[PDB]
Amino acid sequence: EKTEVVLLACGSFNPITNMHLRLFELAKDYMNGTGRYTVVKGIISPVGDAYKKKGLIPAYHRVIMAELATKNSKWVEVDTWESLQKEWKETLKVLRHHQEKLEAAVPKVKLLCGADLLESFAVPNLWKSEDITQIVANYGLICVTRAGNDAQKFIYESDVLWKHRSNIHVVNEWIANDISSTKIRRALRRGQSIRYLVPDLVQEYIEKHNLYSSESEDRNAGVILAPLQRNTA
Amino acid sequence: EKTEVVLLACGSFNPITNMHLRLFELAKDYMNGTGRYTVVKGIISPVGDAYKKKGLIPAYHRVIMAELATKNSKWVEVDTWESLQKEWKETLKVLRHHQEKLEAAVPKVKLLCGADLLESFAVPNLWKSEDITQIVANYGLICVTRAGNDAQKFIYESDVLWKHRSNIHVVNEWIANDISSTKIRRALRRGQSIRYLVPDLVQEYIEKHNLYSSESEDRNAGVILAPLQRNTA
Amino acid sequence: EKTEVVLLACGSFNPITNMHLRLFELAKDYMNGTGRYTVVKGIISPVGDAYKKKGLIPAYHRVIMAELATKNSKWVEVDTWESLQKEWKETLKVLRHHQEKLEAAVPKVKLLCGADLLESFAVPNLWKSEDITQIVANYGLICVTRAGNDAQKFIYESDVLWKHRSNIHVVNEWIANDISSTKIRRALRRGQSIRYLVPDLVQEYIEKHNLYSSESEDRNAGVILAPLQRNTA
Amino acid sequence: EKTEVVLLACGSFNPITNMHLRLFELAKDYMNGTGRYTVVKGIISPVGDAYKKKGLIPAYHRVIMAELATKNSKWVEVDTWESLQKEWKETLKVLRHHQEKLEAAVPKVKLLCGADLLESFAVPNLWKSEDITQIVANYGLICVTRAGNDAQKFIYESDVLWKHRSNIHVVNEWIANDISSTKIRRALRRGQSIRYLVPDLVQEYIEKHNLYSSESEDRNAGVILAPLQRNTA
Amino acid sequence: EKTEVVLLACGSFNPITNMHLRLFELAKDYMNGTGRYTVVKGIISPVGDAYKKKGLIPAYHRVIMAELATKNSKWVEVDTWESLQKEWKETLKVLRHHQEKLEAAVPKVKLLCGADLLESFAVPNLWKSEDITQIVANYGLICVTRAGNDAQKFIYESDVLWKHRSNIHVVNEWIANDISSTKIRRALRRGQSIRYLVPDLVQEYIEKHNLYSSESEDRNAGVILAPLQRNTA
Amino acid sequence: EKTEVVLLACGSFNPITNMHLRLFELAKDYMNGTGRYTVVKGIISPVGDAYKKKGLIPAYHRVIMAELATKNSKWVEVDTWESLQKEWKETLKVLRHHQEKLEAAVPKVKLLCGADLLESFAVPNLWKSEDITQIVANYGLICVTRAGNDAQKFIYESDVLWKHRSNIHVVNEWIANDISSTKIRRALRRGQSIRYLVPDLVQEYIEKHNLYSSESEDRNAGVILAPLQRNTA
Numbered sequence A, B, C, D, E, F: 001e002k003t004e005v006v007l008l009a010c011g012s013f014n015p016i017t018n019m020h021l022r023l024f025e026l027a028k029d030y031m032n033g034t035g036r037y038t039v040v041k042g043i044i045s046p047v048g049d050a051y052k053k054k055g056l057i058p059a060y061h062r063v064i065m066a067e068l069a070t071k072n073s074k075w076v077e078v079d080t081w082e083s084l085q086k087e088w089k090e091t092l093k094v095l096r097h098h099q100e101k102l103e104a105a106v107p108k109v110k111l112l113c114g115a116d117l118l119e120s121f122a123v124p125n126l127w128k129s130e131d132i133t134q135i136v137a138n139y140g141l142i143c144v145t146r147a148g149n150d151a152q153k154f155i156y157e158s159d160v161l162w163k164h165r166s167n168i169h170v171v172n173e174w175i176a177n178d179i180s181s182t183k184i185r186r187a188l189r190r191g192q193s194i195r196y197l198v199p200d201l202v203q204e205y206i207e208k209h210n211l212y213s214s215e216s217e218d219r220n221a222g223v224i225l226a227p228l229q230r231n232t233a
């Protein structure tokens, strides 16, 4: 009857916050609420250090925090495949990977993201055109966000996205919360409480290892983001 | 040297959410960050049932939820005095109570709140004008908010507030947080996840007792908020 | 397999403009486009003069303009049944009348409207709270609007609406062109051209009979709208 | 008494939409309602294919759609001279061509356009500074727009425009329109109805010959706009 | 040839500020700028204390302040007629008075105001509908404002104003300054400097006679504004 | 107890306006109004011509106008040290010059400016980072503005500014004035009145020397601002 689905969220999780977790809760309620789907699992897949994003701290720290964060979740877990590859991995391959790992009525892996990432699809030389087509046509996208109209319009404004709109779901986040990783690192650098913005275990981990600082924010300064170096060379 | 202050946050807490706890964190960082204050304790004071606010479930439960939410707080505690009054009590009075209670240099009690409360000072018949005066003049008011300029403007537009502006500290909430009790109860009636929006013990306590629903939202329908009744009769 | 559906649009249509016609095109495309419905007919049902809406000219003229406006329409037609009733007719009863009429698998009658009409569900005493429930539950509502987030937010704020959410389809109008009747009447009072804002036949008809004036605009001036009368008597 | 004006609108009309026709009716009512002018003719002049604008279909088709759109216009007509020109023509040369054509009291030829075109005067290398001056100074510019306080701000910021302000008439479009050619093409590529957004004959012509597609949309892709080509070499 | 005009500004001038003076410079530059008018004089006409506007100090101080403000003006002067009547005087009358006094080619008197006043034409019972008609029909209105589009729209929305639009001139205040009398009194009450907001002499007359206070702001507290009493009795 | 401060405002004052003078009234009111500062002097320090800002007329005239503008001020004066420097001086140096001067308790010198200058800190290569740091840390900055949430946010978005937030006082301008020099020059070139936007003497001096024109606006056309030239060579 209903189609089973696995929500896969690729990201930097630098560091993970209640917001990324909350992203899962919302997508699940929505998907299960349509009556035509059953969300069987949530997978958080931290990006490997080969991504080179500014300030991106070492993967093990990010993976451990994301594990610490899901420890009390009953349906959301961390998968380390992508973080372990040596070369940065294109989200479409990370999707094809878990979709195949499942084939061994098979659950459909769908990409879970906020409007943020959905919109980078338009940044020049960031995403391969064929990648986007396959991602929305063969897996599906589930976009959670406050600016529901922005996202809806962004879709309307792209022929590929519009064509596969049946396979793309914008999920409104009426409870306006935005605990951005950037604001968190900022708060940390400035010695301010992030208590209640991230899970206590993550907060404790960050504290013990004294993660995030001016030094850390500088990692990868002046280094082009992996996806771009690829489409420029 | 520094003025020790106690942050008293009066409200319904129907139910307490991460946002209300976040409020104490912000205010603490801000007050200590000024260098001229030392925040020694936070006090969550739920409103007795005589308030009659629409949807207000029993005080005892709201008190229990606040204690649950603060089990793991080293400086924020709950105070039941207000919840025990047969007669709804005016915030000015609650403040006098705590200030007088503290005397037994003595820390100063300041009312912690959002811009929602500050602005309601202008709702007709809601607050006693002479009360607004002694609150800001004699105690103080720490107002946390996402719209700092509207709060600023609101203060500038009132001779009483402006005059005593040195006792009104507008605190900026750069991390967009809007976890309103109203949206929580709304999610609850619909069976949606409210995990990571409220502390877990609070979510668990609520799930267990089915505290929020259509029927509870109707409590006090047609009844006049206590303060308004008292200033019209 | 696919649900045959009929779009019924109740409204004053005083006068009908390219915009009301556009409503039918946008909705049909959407429904047909979701793959689960097949729009077979469009019905324009001008409200009866008993509505007593400020500026409402005689129904017969409004009916005829709707006829001219759809004279070339392959699928949209004009039904005079509601206008011919002596008493003002609630939309629920008109929906029933037309659904019952079709039953003589039968096609499902759905209410076609704009954000305007949807949000008026919240005007005190305007709609019976049960008529609303039966409309969204037993019939369905297709709401066309430029401000989609507002319409959706309106659904999210209403338990009843949110509850029958799967029967309420918000359709985005990306080609934002609000040719309101109010601006058409004003333009005619000032002798402006309204050509290309309404179908030529309607334009020509209006000029020939000199329909809109300061006079017609004063019709029902001071009379309380029919739905509000009923709900006060 | 009055000055007899002829409104010349140069543009691509790819394809012409109700809003373009609406442009003429708006301007005629405004110029005539000042009491000091008399609009005697409206001329639509489709740009030639040599303009190399992305997505621009053959002038043959744009001319014929412009003609069907105006077949029932008592005062607006189409002039094929600009399009039939092997070379792309500067608007100044087209204005001139038409003025001179008339002198063979002579009606003043004025440029009819939207805030769009007017604001493009600031696009580096798009318009020759002297051609701008000569258009506003020797011909006149009637700019229809929804954003009157932009067209106005733009004139107030250009010493040149401001100096000839008396010859630049900003006409307000109160019926918030937006039927852009881009959005019509997008809809046609998506097989969506455009009925009631353009004249029936144009709709029928476009449908019958499947004029707009992904293919047509790609015409000239990578080709620099004729004006930019000229002012850079 | 050119029409001579006298700009009459009816207002409370409580107190007058650089902005009121500014109003005249702006209007004069505009009227003269059109090339078809010649501004030969400006007239500031303080409202009589019979207006009963809350906080309105005595006419004599307002008149002396306005004369002091215009001491150095070569073309703007104060007329005391209005302020000298025992009965509050309808602006249409104040206009008729000055126009008749000029006939003693003959300069046309036109009312000079901000958007504030133009728009108050809508407030229920504030202006006798026939007065508005005569003012825009038989004299003319020059409205200076930062919100040129609002005034423009407000006119568009009024059949009366729109019909005589050729006699109404909206003049754009590009160098936005908004020294409202209200903010001046507020600043004064608070002991804040008003230097450089009003003319030095005015600023010095207020300092000398301690004109604005809490006390004064209360004048006419609870007294219905004169025009309102008249149109409700 | 209270700290004596001197407000130093570095800028072009090309030409000085009411607004620049306004800046000192506001800031003196704010600082003394905090109860912990005593503002003893205001200093207008016009920039030397070595600055090379486009359109900057000769130092001498700017200095004279500043003196005419402040002739009658009890506490605000003009210091020509910057105007007399052959090489453009970095604001830090000016601040250092005055501070040292005073030391011959000693008043603290603080930079007075608008949000405009503050935000210019992010213009690439405009200000030397070590300078920004030294200015906010060792001297102080009082920023006046109508968009103080933009200044508040700009401070919050920079670690250095945030780190020194205690030394940066954002002062709200509730009376909305944006009488910029650029708009004044635009008005003068167009022959419009600027009476009441600048003090009378200043306006009289500009009119007598015909200081601002198309020609003057061209000074330094094509030359890089001193600061930018320095940090790029």
Ligand SMILES: Nc1ncnc2c1ncn2[C@@H]1O[C@H](COP(=O)(O)OP(=O)(O)OC[C@H]2O[C@@H]([n+]3cccc(C(=O)O)c3)[C@H](O)[C@@H]2O)[C@@H](O)[C@H]1O
Binding pocket: A009, A010, A011, A012, A013, A014, A019, A020, A023, A047, A051, A053, A089, A090, A091, A092, A112, A113, A114, A115, A116, A117, A118, A120, A126, A127, A128, A131, A144, A145, A146, A177, A178, A179, A180, A181, A227
């Ligand atoms: N407030 C908010 N509300 C709702 N969702 C929010 C959010 N803030 C972040 N999010 C979402 O959180 C998730 C993770 O956030 P964050 O830690 O910031 O993750 P971020 O660094 O933005 O992750 C970018 C991801 O895209 C992948 N990518 C980028 C570029 C090209 C290609 C390619 O295959 O060509 C792939 C990349 O490998 C990485 O997995 C995202 O889905 C983001 O949109």
Ligand SMILES: Nc1ncnc2c1ncn2[C@@H]1O[C@H](COP(=O)(O)OP(=O)(O)OC[C@H]2O[C@@H]([n+]3cccc(C(=O)O)c3)[C@H](O)[C@@H]2O)[C@@H](O)[C@H]1O
Binding pocket: B009, B010, B011, B012, B013, B014, B019, B020, B023, B047, B051, B053, B089, B090, B091, B092, B093, B112, B113, B114, B115, B116, B117, B118, B126, B127, B128, B131, B144, B145, B146, B177, B178, B179, B180, B181, B227
């Ligand atoms: N998004 C947000 N960001 C920051 N702060 C936010 C917030 N949403 C709520 N808050 C704050 O959270 C706190 C608790 O909220 P909530 O639980 O909804 O509490 P609420 O019902 O708004 O609390 C009303 C309180 O005001 C008192 N009151 C009302 C009227 C007259 C008088 C009187 O003495 O005359 C006193 C009343 O006794 C009670 O203690 C408030 O201070 C609120 O402003």
Ligand SMILES: Nc1ncnc2c1ncn2[C@@H]1O[C@H](COP(=O)(O)OP(=O)(O)OC[C@H]2O[C@@H]([n+]3cccc(C(=O)O)c3)[C@H](O)[C@@H]2O)[C@@H](O)[C@H]1O
Binding pocket: C009, C010, C011, C012, C013, C014, C019, C020, C023, C047, C051, C053, C089, C090, C091, C092, C112, C113, C114, C115, C116, C117, C118, C126, C127, C128, C131, C144, C145, C146, C173, C177, C178, C179, C180, C181, C227
């Ligand atoms: N720009 C725009 N974009 C998209 N849609 C737009 C629109 N402007 C109007 N519309 C829609 O066009 C349609 C016709 O509009 P208009 O001519 O103005 O018609 P209008 O007067 O708004 O029609 C109101 C209708 O609601 C019915 N009603 C009202 C209140 C209570 C009850 C009851 O049963 O209790 C029933 C009433 O009998 C009538 O049929 C509406 O659905 C309107 O919202």
Ligand SMILES: Nc1ncnc2c1ncn2[C@@H]1O[C@H](COP(=O)(O)OP(=O)(O)OC[C@H]2O[C@@H]([n+]3cccc(C(=O)O)c3)[C@H](O)[C@@H]2O)[C@@H](O)[C@H]1O
Binding pocket: D009, D010, D011, D012, D013, D014, D019, D020, D023, D047, D051, D053, D089, D090, D091, D092, D112, D113, D114, D115, D116, D117, D118, D126, D127, D128, D131, D144, D145, D146, D173, D177, D178, D179, D180, D181, D227
């Ligand atoms: N919503 C709206 N409301 C009101 N008016 C609107 C409008 N959308 C477009 N318009 C107006 O409709 C008209 C037709 O638009 P569209 O079909 O898109 O025509 P478009 O491609 O924008 O036309 C450009 C025209 O400018 C000429 N041009 C461009 C650049 C440099 C020079 C030169 O001599 O140096 C000349 C060019 O030859 C062509 O005739 C325009 O005047 C446009 O602004």
Ligand SMILES: Nc1ncnc2c1ncn2[C@@H]1O[C@H](COP(=O)(O)OP(=O)(O)OC[C@H]2O[C@@H]([n+]3cccc(C(=O)O)c3)[C@H](O)[C@@H]2O)[C@@H](O)[C@H]1O
Binding pocket: E009, E010, E011, E012, E013, E014, E019, E020, E023, E047, E051, E053, E089, E090, E091, E092, E112, E113, E114, E115, E116, E117, E118, E126, E127, E128, E131, E144, E145, E146, E177, E178, E179, E180, E181, E227
């Ligand atoms: N920021 C700004 N930009 C441009 N103009 C601005 C302005 N602030 C005020 N102004 C203008 O300044 C002028 C004087 O300001 P202010 O002192 O505040 O004038 P205010 O008290 O608003 O003056 C009301 C005037 O209207 C008359 N009135 C009222 C109601 C009904 C009738 C009737 O005949 O039925 C007549 C009344 O007798 C009095 O002369 C006004 O024209 C105002 O709009």
Ligand SMILES: Nc1ncnc2c1ncn2[C@@H]1O[C@H](COP(=O)(O)OP(=O)(O)OC[C@H]2O[C@@H]([n+]3cccc(C(=O)O)c3)[C@H](O)[C@@H]2O)[C@@H](O)[C@H]1O
Binding pocket: F009, F010, F011, F012, F013, F014, F019, F020, F023, F047, F051, F053, F089, F090, F091, F092, F112, F113, F114, F115, F116, F117, F118, F126, F127, F128, F131, F144, F145, F146, F177, F178, F179, F180, F181, F227
């Ligand atoms: N509306 C408004 N409200 C409040 N204040 C306003 C204002 N408009 C301007 N102001 C303020 O007025 C003052 C003077 O205005 P204006 O004449 O336009 O001054 P402007 O030319 O913008 O002043 C530049 C100043 O910055 C210094 N600077 C620039 C770049 C790098 C460095 C360095 O050390 O590296 C120093 C420069 O030497 C000069 O003193 C400024 O503080 C400006 O922000």
